[PDB]
Amino acid sequence: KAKTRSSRAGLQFPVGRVHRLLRKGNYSERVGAGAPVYLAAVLEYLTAEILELAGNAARDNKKTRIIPRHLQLAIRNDEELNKLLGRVTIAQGGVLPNIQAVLLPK
Amino acid sequence: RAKAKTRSSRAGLQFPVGRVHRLLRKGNYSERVGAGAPVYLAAVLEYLTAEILELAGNAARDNKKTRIIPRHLQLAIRNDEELNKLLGRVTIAQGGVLPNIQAVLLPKK
Amino acid sequence: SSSVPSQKTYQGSYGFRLGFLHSGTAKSVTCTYSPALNKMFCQLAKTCPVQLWVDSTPPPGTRVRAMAIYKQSQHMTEVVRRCPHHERCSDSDGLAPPQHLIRVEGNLRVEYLDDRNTFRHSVVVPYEPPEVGSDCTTIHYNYMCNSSCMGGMNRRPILTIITLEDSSGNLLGRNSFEVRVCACPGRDRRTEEENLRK
Amino acid sequence: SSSVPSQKTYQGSYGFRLGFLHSGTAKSVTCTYSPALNKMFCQLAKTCPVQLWVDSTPPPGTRVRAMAIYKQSQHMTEVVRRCPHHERCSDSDGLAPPQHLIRVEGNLRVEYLDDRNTFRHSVVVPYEPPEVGSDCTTIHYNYMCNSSCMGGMNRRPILTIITLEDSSGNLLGRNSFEVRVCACPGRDRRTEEENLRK
Amino acid sequence: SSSVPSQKTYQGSYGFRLGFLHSGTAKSVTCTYSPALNKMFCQLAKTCPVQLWVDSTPPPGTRVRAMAIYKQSQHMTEVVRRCPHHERCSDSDGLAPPQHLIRVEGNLRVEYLDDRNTFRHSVVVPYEPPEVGSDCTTIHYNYMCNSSCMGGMNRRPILTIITLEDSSGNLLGRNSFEVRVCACPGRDRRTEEENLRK
Amino acid sequence: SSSVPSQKTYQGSYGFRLGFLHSGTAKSVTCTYSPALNKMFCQLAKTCPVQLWVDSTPPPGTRVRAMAIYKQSQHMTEVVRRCPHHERCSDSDGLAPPQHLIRVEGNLRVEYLDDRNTFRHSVVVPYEPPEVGSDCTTIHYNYMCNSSCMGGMNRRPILTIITLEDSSGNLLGRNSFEVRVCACPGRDRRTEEENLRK
Amino acid sequence: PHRYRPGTVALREIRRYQKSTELLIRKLPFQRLVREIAQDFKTDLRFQSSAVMALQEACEAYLVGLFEDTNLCAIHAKRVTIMPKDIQLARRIRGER
Amino acid sequence: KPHRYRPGTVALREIRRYQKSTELLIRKLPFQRLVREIAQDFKTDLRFQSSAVMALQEACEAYLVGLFEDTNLCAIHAKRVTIMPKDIQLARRIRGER
Amino acid sequence: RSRKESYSIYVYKVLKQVHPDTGISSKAMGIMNSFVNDIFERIAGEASRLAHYNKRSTITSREIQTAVRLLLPGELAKHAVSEGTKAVTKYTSAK
Amino acid sequence: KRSRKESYSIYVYKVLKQVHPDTGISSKAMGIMNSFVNDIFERIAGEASRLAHYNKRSTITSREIQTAVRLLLPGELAKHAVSEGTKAVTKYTSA
Amino acid sequence: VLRDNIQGITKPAIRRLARRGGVKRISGLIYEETRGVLKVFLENVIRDAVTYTEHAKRKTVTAMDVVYALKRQGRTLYGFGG
Amino acid sequence: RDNIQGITKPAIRRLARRGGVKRISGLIYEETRGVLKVFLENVIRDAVTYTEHAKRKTVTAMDVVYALKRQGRTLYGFGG
DNA sequence: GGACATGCCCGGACATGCCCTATATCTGACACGTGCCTGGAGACTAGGGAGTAATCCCCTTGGCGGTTAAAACGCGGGGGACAGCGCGTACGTGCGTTTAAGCGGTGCTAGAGCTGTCTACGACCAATTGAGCGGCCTCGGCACCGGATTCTCAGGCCTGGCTCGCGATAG
DNA sequence: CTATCGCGAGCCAGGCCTGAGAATCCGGTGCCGAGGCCGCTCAATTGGTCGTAGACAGCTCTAGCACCGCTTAAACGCACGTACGCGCTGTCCCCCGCGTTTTAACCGCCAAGGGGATTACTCCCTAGTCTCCAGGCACGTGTCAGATATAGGGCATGTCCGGGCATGTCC
């Protein structure tokens, strides 16, 4: 029987795949055993946060399936995610429904 | 044994082919590096150095200075459209800025 | 009037008879006929169907005339006409003179006569034979005052006399029925029928 | 009419009031007055005594005028007049025009006016101080249609307005009462009085 | 109108009969026919299929005409037309005059007639023998007012008279059916069928 | 219309207010007002009394104008007018144009305006103070279509705007109320009042 | 007849197109422009469908963002109408001009 | 009366003077105290190399000069001359720092 | 039969962990894959540069942690470091 | 005697003497030149590595370097650098 | 050879782009500047894309080439490959 | 503490002059101070992070050079 | 006068409008299963990179003093920010026209992509040595300074020209 | 007495000259950092070997291009009205510029210590290889969800009429 490092760690992203991608990315001649575990774990965390917010936005929109619009809403409405993705354009995301106050009628 | 002569001399360049080759090998860019890559890289680096130093010298003589100072380097970089584009996001220490006044700020008769 | 129109039933050569619908005695039925009384009970201006039955078809040019007379002998010489109020009100259908009690509805060829000699009013239409696949011809009359109209019929009963005539006015046949024009034909019909037993 | 006559009670300088007889309410009574309703109930063409009371005697040339108007506000502008039937019947007393609702009986000096500007009818007589030994002057009115006459008052209540006026027609005093002209004054008076409790 | 079109069934030489679809009596039913009543119940401006059946094929040039008349005898002389509202609304299909009650849909060779003598409206198309697969030719009519339209049919029942005619409008056959144009054909059909037992 | 008349309540210098009778909600009461809804419910062509109250008497020459507009904002620019059927029917009182929804009854001095600039209909009469005893002036309006008339109000609610104007037509005061013209005012009033709790 | 006030329909269109996600530049003219510019860089180029869609998504995002910044600069100057000088200021401050 | 230049002449003179030269314009020691103060809010008892503070100071002055250039361009765009906080906020918003 | 590289099954498991009632479209899946690959490249590159600058030839957890602290915002960095440390400690104990 | 610290100072001076025989260089300016050359080095080497990775290439050649130079350098600068590199590489290969 | 395709970027398209950007009113003079800006963007992006294509010994610009070009210009685009 | 006042009004004026502005509102100075402070928070954060990763207790010039480079503005003249 | 005679009004209730919702069917786009194969997991090996400890020195921190240039503060004023107003013109909105964008089907061939082979080419390793860096010394860039010379721009004063007012002469 | 013309005086504008600040130039000393030279050392060079990777050939088969046709929605041209950009004007306030006071920044000089860089020893941690196996990724079969339209189902609200009241009539 073979049991994987992700299974021993209780995580969802594959330790082996992240490890291989680090080994083949021409980044360093050696890679420690804990580095791909840490990296994979951070990726789960960030994915869970983004999917959490996108799901919330979908439910607010009475949608059961997340669409790119919901991803854009999630990234732009969250202050820290928008900072992290400040220079990132999501396709079919649109923009936030933001109107300047001076442009509203009197 | 044949007399030792460097690849930079064989290529007619001043930058060290051996050192650039070593830095490419040890920069964790790839496991394998060709012989011509460091020659090409040295040639581009030498060319850019010669043009920047040429312009900085011109500025220095325009200022009646014989020694290149950071101010002359900044002037040379900003006075060249292509160098200014290449170094658009670079700040030169002790370089100052280009003298420039918007027309609306000048006095009127 | 100088005269009184005959009211004698005369079926004549063509076997001329009248028929009426079987409408019941609902308090305010628009038009209901009483076989017991030979009397039509109807509302003012409402449709009153009268069927013309013949054994054989009268010649083309045959006309059907209707005329009212007072039923009581002492009133017989008085011309039946509309009261002053209804005469003046604006209800003419564009065809009937305002003072005529009896109108025919739905017939462009209707003529209204004011007899120069007798002073009687009457309304006449061409007789139209029933479709060869039919039994009778229906004429639709309207009565334009209530029997009770003061200054008019003033609660005196009338007869309607229906005459079958040739082109010239020659008597081919005659029938008649009593008429009460009233607000509640069914109520009034049942009352008069009950009173027959009294 | 272009206008509506004022109905405001105004006793004026001469203390002008109306009085009425104490007739009871036998259904057949010809004329009976209800103090509870300030309403006269009377039969068509029958004598209706109205008493004029004053605290002091108005000058010679003073006249007394009677005019009817509809009591309900939406009918107020409609001139009160006889129905087409009674207008046409042959009951004029030789003095009153056929279309006037209100007549005065037993006065050769009666005048009937058809106002050129308002189109209102009225009847006017000279005021006469009471006969010596009397405290009031009685005028006898006749009403020449029933309140129910179709094409006339048509079941609408009316007021009679009695005005005391000077020789130019200027107002000296005014009083009024409601009138129902009907077949059974006593019956109808008791009915309306009973309905006051309802 | 000066006249009334005959409504007598006449199968004629070609054995002309009408047929109708078997639509039930539900809600959302746009056209349903009652064999018990010989009456079509349909919605305004909805497709009403009428089948033409013949025992033998009429000559080329044969036409099929549809005309409405009021069913009740007293209304028979009144031309059936659209009410003032629908007459004015903007629903003409480019072919039918605005005042015609009855249209044929899906036929470029449709003609609309306004008879100069009778004043009757009618709609006529060329007769075409049945298509391969069918023993009948189907014509699709639209009725452009509800039976209840005020100022129009005003709740009076009509008959549609379907005539098979020649080029010179001579009669080859005739059939007819009653029509109610209404919002709920299934509801109304079941109601009238139930009332047959009453 | 190019514009929309203001509906803002404005009692103005004369303390102009409206009042209404206390009619209950019997199924078919002719005209009944709902304080809860500020809405009049009335039958077509029936008398609708509206009381004008003022704290002090406006000058001679003052006029009272009535105009209808649609209550729903998207319909506000559409001129309120009679439906094609009632426009064509023969019910004009000799004074009102056939297309005007709102009439005044019983006033010879009524004027009907068709505004050349706004295209709005209105009906105006001279203001008349009450007699010094009385406390208000009553105007009697008639509404000449049902709210439901197709091609007319087509089931859209309207407001009646009553304005007090000087002799030049300048604004002195304004009030308004909603109107439903319908067959059963009492039924419909109770239904809408009940729905207030829903 | 009826006429909307200046500004209401503009705002309605803004809300409409900011709520949805469909592309606003026509496919065929964008492709034609891209191909035209390309002839002067390299001859007889072929372009993948997803490549043209990529250029169009990038272009529309860039222009929308630039118009956002332009609008902010115009409103800053107590104006509403965008001017060429507004575009030039936005691009200069962004650092590409 | 003593001599006095009209508003602006002396402003332009200092502009020319400080744009011709490259010597630092912000005081070394107060900036140094600020940097150490701000730093203890991340890590206490932190030390700084001299060339590290000089690097931070060079970076700060270059950053401020560029920001003031952009602010001036935005002010001139609005047919104004005097810069105000909303100008700074617009410049930083358009740069993508806000 | 050209094998490719995507995190589809792992993204779907995490989604089912956080929301076991929501799906995802192809365009949205492409956006998630682009996002994860971009983050990966950014973090791995910063860690590589960190290691080179410090004369380190091995990729260990301390450079990864520092790179995460540099790249992630405040609360995101703190939560990521906490989850990474707990997970690495549990794995190390589990061996 | 400290540790071996590499720099381009002597090479910058040789190029300067080629282009400006009678011009000197200050220490601050030489430091700026070293920063510049190292920055360009990092940019070109990194872009070339990424280019090679994207194309599943395991060997660093002259084509990726030249293409990276063309991406990073402006038009006429790129043409002159490419010309110099090709002549230099062909001359070296002749040896 | 395609010629004068710049006129295919219509006035209403630029207006729609401005609407999505929050612009309420657009001067008639806006369009040529916007067209120029768009053109500039294209000449830079396409230059990088084609450079990558030529290095890869290809004659067809791929989606990955464009995405990579955008990334190296700081305008990284999601949805066409990583 | 109070040390933010050590970047005095004439210092902000001088920096603004090198930025080419002719007139400076009184409300400018606090705004400039805030902007400068935020910049410092971000730079010093990155610098100290680098210093701690190296297991050092003193922030070096090279730490600052890396912080500035990663912030998106490369500084020449202090090594690297 | 009581008992009917006879019309009118309207609440009951049906006729028959219209929307209102719910269920079923059809169309479109998407979760999960399967087989395989190749990339990940367990195990063993070497070796070298990293952890740790001692050392040294340099370079960072802290303190004292002066002194002077810069920062802080006061105050006058002028010019620039800003609010208000008028206008005219350029842009928003709507409508009829036309134009081409979009969609669906179909072809074919160019070219992306995969596989096989092999040879050129780059990693690796040992010996050499000469290029490059650290340290020391010196002289010239050149600034740093200060003081006289040169000088352009601004302000003030004087002169000339034009306009207005007053007086005189002529009609 | 009034009007017109001429002369004189006053005011405004333009030009020229003088003053004054700022810059240029000249010399001087001096200083300290850049350039050069020399020792050394370690990193590049050269020569040889070996694995491997990518260059080229060749085959497949995907998708990009080209075209045709139909539709319809978007673009376009124009008419028109009006809101906003822009120019102008007035006001007042608040920032500049300069004089005076203060303070702290800087330069120099010295002391200490602590931590950063260096070297040496060790050990354990990860690449490399092998063997195996299971997870992940093309291919695929149907199914599930959403929208739309048809069946119940409510209200939405007019017309007719039986009942019951109103009101005339008379032996």
Domain CATH number, residue L76: 1.10.20.10
According to DSSP H, which parts of C29-108 are helical? Answer: 84-88
Query: If you write DSSP's letter for every residue of L21-51 in order, what string do you get?
Result: -SEE-TTHHHHHHHHHHHHHHHHHHHHHHHH
Whole-number Å distance between alpha carbons of E33 and E21: 7
Query: If you write DSSP's letter for every residue of D71-110 in order, what string do you get?
Result: SSGGGTTSPP---HHHHHSS---SSS-TT-SEEE-S-TT-
Longest dimension (CA), chain I: 48
Tell me which long-range contacts K65-71 makes (C-beta under 8 A, separation of at least 24): K65/G51, K66/G51, K66/G54, K66/G55, K66/G58, K67/G54, K68/J54, K69/K45, K70/G54, K70/G58, K70/K45
C81 to chain D: which residues are within 8 Å by CB?
Answer: none
Specify whether the CB–CB gap between F32 and F185 falls below 8 A: yes
What is the Cα F157 distance to its own chain's centre?
12
Virtual CA dihedral for F51, F56, F61, F65, nearest 10 degrees?
A: -30
Q: Which residues pair with D164 in a beta bridge?
A: D64, D173
Query: If you write DSSP's letter for every residue of B31-88 in order, what string do you get?
Result: SEE-SHHHHHHHHHHHHHHHHHHHHHHHHHHHTT-SEE-HHHHHHHHHT-HHHHHHTT
Element (H, E) at E51: strand E48-53
**CA-angle at F146, arms to F142 and F148, nearest 5°:** 160
One-letter amino acid identity for F118?
T
CATH no. for E17-195:
2.60.40.720
Virtual CA dihedral for K63, K65, K68, K74, nearest 10 degrees?
A: -90
DSSP class of F93: -
Place of tokens 């300048």: F170
DSSP class of E147: T
N144 C1' to I37 CA distance, Å:
32
Dihedral over Cα of B73, B77, B78, B80: its sign = positive
- Chain I nearest C-alpha distance from A36 (Å): 8
Encode C33-45 in three state secondary structure. Answer: EECCCCEEEECCC
Whole-number Å distance between alpha carbons of A54 and A66: 6
N82 C1' to G15 CA distance, Å:
24
Burial of J56 (0-12, 13-18, 19+ CB in 10 A): exposed
Q: Which residues pair with D33 in a beta bridge?
A: D40
Domain enclosing residue B89, as ranges: 6-108
**CA-angle at I70, arms to I65 and I75, nearest 5°:** 85
Q: How many CB atoms lie within 10 A of CB C2?
A: 8
Whole-number Å distance between alpha carbons of E90 and A104: 40
Strand-strand pairing, A30-31 and I58-59? parallel
Whole-number Å distance between alpha carbons of E52 and E138: 6
Whole-number Å distance between alpha carbons of D110 and D87: 19
Specify whether the CB–CB gap between I46 and I66 falls below 8 A: no
Whole-number Å distance between alpha carbons of E104 and K63: 58
M92 C1' to G9 CA distance, Å:
9
B27 to chain I: which residues are within 8 Å by CB?
Answer: 52
Tell me the nt nearest to I29, Cα to C1'.
M30
Pick from H67, H84, H66: which is nearest to H75 by CA? H84
Burial of D60 (0-12, 13-18, 19+ CB in 10 A): exposed
Q: Three-class SS of residue H92?
A: helix
Strand-strand pairing, E31-34 and D158-165? unpaired
Structure-block tokens of residue I24: 């995802």
I45 to chain A: which residues are within 8 Å by CB?
Answer: 27
Q: Which residues pair with D63 in a beta bridge?
A: D126, D165
Strand-strand pairing, K60-61 and G46-47? parallel
Domain covering G1-97 assigned CATH 1.10.1790.20 in the classification: no
* CB within 7 A of strand N (chain B, 90-109): none
According to DSSP H, which parts of chain C are helical? Answer: 84-88, 185-194
* Sequence-separated (6 or more) residues with CB below 8 Å from residue F196: F36, F37
Helix I61-71 / helix I26-53 crossing angle, nearest 10 deg: 120
**Strand residue runs (E) in C45-149:** 48-53, 63-70, 102-104, 111-114, 121-126, 137-143
Whole-number Å distance between alpha carbons of A7 and A14: 9
* CB within 7 A of strand N (chain H, 4-33): 4-5, 7-11, 13, 16, 27-30, 33
Specify whether the CB–CB gap between C148 and C182 falls below 8 A: yes
Specify whether the CB–CB gap between D80 and D101 falls below 8 A: yes
Whole-number Å distance between alpha carbons of B21 and B37: 8
Specify whether the CB–CB gap between C25 and C16 falls below 8 A: no
Strand-strand pairing, C121-126 and C63-70? antiparallel
What is the Cα C144 distance to its own chain's centre?
11
Whole-number Å distance between alpha carbons of E92 and C21: 42
Whole-number Å distance between alpha carbons of B94 and H57: 11
Specify whether the CB–CB gap between F32 and F25 falls below 8 A: yes
Q: Which residues pair with F37 in a beta bridge?
A: none
Q: Which residues pair with F171 in a beta bridge?
A: F165
Architecture of H1-98 per CATH? Orthogonal Bundle (1.10)
Instruction: Based on DSSP, count helices (H) and strands (E) in chain J, helices before strands.
Output: 4, 2
**Strand residue runs (E) in chain I:** 23-24, 58-59
- Breaks in chain F (C–N > 2.5 Å) following residue: none
Pick from B63, K26, C30: which is nearest to J23 by CA? B63
Specify whether the CB–CB gap between B64 and B57 falls below 8 A: no
Specify whether the CB–CB gap between D163 and D52 falls below 8 A: no
On the CB side of F126, CA atoms within 13 Å amount to 11
Pick from E156, E139, E173: which is nearest to E80 by CA? E156
* Domains in chain I, CATH or no CATH each: 1-95 (1.10.20.10)
Burial of C86 (0-12, 13-18, 19+ CB in 10 A): buried
Q: What phi, psi does G53 have (nearest 5°)? A: -65, -35
Question: Per-domain residue ranges for chain D?
Answer: 17-197
Interface of D with F (CB under 8 A): 1-2, 6-8, 73-78
Specify whether the CB–CB gap between E24 and E186 falls below 8 A: yes
Burial of H13 (0-12, 13-18, 19+ CB in 10 A): exposed
DSSP class of F98: T
Encode chain K in three state secondary structure. Answer: CCCCCHHHCCHHHHHHHHHHCCCCEECCCHHHHHHHHHHHHHHHHHHHHHHHHHHCCCCEECHHHHHHHHHHCCCEEECCCC
Whole-number Å distance between alpha carbons of E82 and I10: 70
Specify whether the CB–CB gap between D149 and D83 falls below 8 A: yes
Element (H, E) at E63: strand E63-70
Whole-number Å distance between alpha carbons of E8 and E173: 10
Whole-number Å distance between alpha carbons of A92 and A70: 10
Give per-residue burial for H56-86: e unless 16+ CB within 10 Å, then b.
bbbbbbbbbbbbbbbbbbbbbbbeebebbbb
Encode D12-70 in three state secondary structure. Answer: CCCCCEEECCCCCCCCCCCEEEECCCCEEEECCCCCEEEEEECCCCCCCCCEEEEEEEE
Pick from E143, E138, E140: which is nearest to E180 by CA? E143
Judge whether residue A4 contacts strand N, using its CB and a 7 Å cut-off: yes
Whole-number Å distance between alpha carbons of I44 and E50: 79
G75 touches chain H (CB under 8 A): no
Helix B36-62 / helix J62-72 crossing angle, nearest 10 deg: 30
B94 touches chain I (CB under 8 A): no
Element (H, E) at I28: helix I26-53
The experimental technique used to determine this model is: cryo-EM
Pick from F28, F2, F37, F31: which is nearest to F138 by CA? F31
Whole-number Å distance between alpha carbons of C26 and C29: 5
What is the Cα K65 distance to its own chain's centre?
14
Specify whether the CB–CB gap between D178 and D157 falls below 8 A: yes
Which A residues in the span 18-37 are in contact with J, Cβ-Cβ below 8 Å? Answer: 25-26
Strand-strand pairing, E48-53 and E137-143? antiparallel
**Nucleotides, chain N, CB distance < 7 Å:** 20-23, 33-36, 42-47, 52-55, 63-65, 74-76, 81-86, 94-99, 104-106, 114-119, 125-127, 133-139, 146, 150-154, 156-164, 166-170
What CATH code is carried by the domain that includes residue A103?
1.10.20.10
Specify whether the CB–CB gap between H8 and L22 falls below 8 A: yes
Domain enclosing residue K55, as ranges: 3-82
Q: Which residues pair with C63 in a beta bridge?
A: C126, C165
Whole-number Å distance between alpha carbons of E63 and E127: 5
CA gyration radius, chain I: 16
Virtual CA dihedral for H17, H23, H26, H28, nearest 10 degrees?
A: -160
Strand-strand pairing, K76-78 and A88-90? parallel
* Sequence-separated (6 or more) residues with CB below 8 Å from residue F170: none
Residue count (chain E): 198
Q: How many CB atoms lie within 10 A of CB F145?
A: 23
M151 C1' to H72 CA distance, Å:
34
Structure-block tokens of residue H55: 């690097």
* CB within 7 A of strand N (chain L, 55-74): 55-58, 60
Of all residues in chain K, the one with the smallest CA distance to G37 is K43
Place of tokens 């998630």: I32
Query: If you write DSSP's letter for every residue of F125-150 in order, what string do you get?
Result: EE--PPPSS---EEEEEEE-S-TT-T
Whole-number Å distance between alpha carbons of K6 and J89: 42
According to DSSP H, which parts of chain G are helical? Answer: 8-19, 27-39, 49-76, 84-94
* Sequence-separated (6 or more) residues with CB below 8 Å from residue A95: A72, A76, G18, G64, G68, K20, K21
Q: Three-class SS of residue A61?
A: coil
Give per-residue burial for H34-51: e unless 16+ CB within 10 Å, then b.
bbbebbeeeeeebebbeb
Specify whether the CB–CB gap between E177 and E34 falls below 8 A: no
Place of tokens 């402070």: L37
Structure-block tokens of residue I8: 């589809």
Whole-number Å distance between alpha carbons of C190 and F50: 46
On the CB side of F34, CA atoms within 13 Å amount to 22
On the CB side of B41, CA atoms within 13 Å amount to 33
Structure-block tokens of residue C160: 């309607």
Specify whether the CB–CB gap between E157 and E178 falls below 8 A: yes
* Sequence-separated (6 or more) residues with CB below 8 Å from residue C127: C52, C58, C62, C63, C64, C137, C164
Q: Three-class SS of residue F4?
A: coil
Q: What is the resolution of this structure in A?
A: 4.5
Judge whether residue J62 contacts strand N, using its CB and a 7 Å cut-off: no
Domain covering C17-197 assigned CATH 2.60.40.720 in the classification: yes
Element (H, E) at F122: strand F121-126
| Interchain touch K–D (≥3 Cβ pairs closer than 8 Å) | no
Specify whether the CB–CB gap between F109 and D2 falls below 8 A: yes
Nearest-by-Cβ selection for J71 from K51, K56, K64: K51
**CA-angle at H84, arms to H83 and H87, nearest 5°:** 80
Structure-block tokens of residue G8: 């209401």
Pick from E91, E85, E102, E103: which is nearest to E149 by CA? E85
Dihedral over Cα of A61, A67, A72, A77: its sign = positive
Query: If you write DSSP's letter for every residue of D119-186 in order, what string do you get?
Result: --EEEEEE--PPPTT-SSEEEEEEE-S-TT-TTTTTT--EEEEEEEE-TTS-EEEEEEEEEEE-S-HH
Q: Which residues pair with F31 in a beta bridge?
A: F42
Structure-block tokens of residue C24: 């019941």
Q: Which residues of D are annotated as a binding site?
A: 83, 86, 145, 149
Q: What phi, psi does C12 have (nearest 5°)? A: 65, -165
Counted domains in chain K: 1
Q: Three-class SS of residue C159?
A: strand
Structure-block tokens of residue D102: 């209100």
Whole-number Å distance between alpha carbons of I58 and J37: 27
| Interchain touch B–H (≥3 Cβ pairs closer than 8 Å) | yes
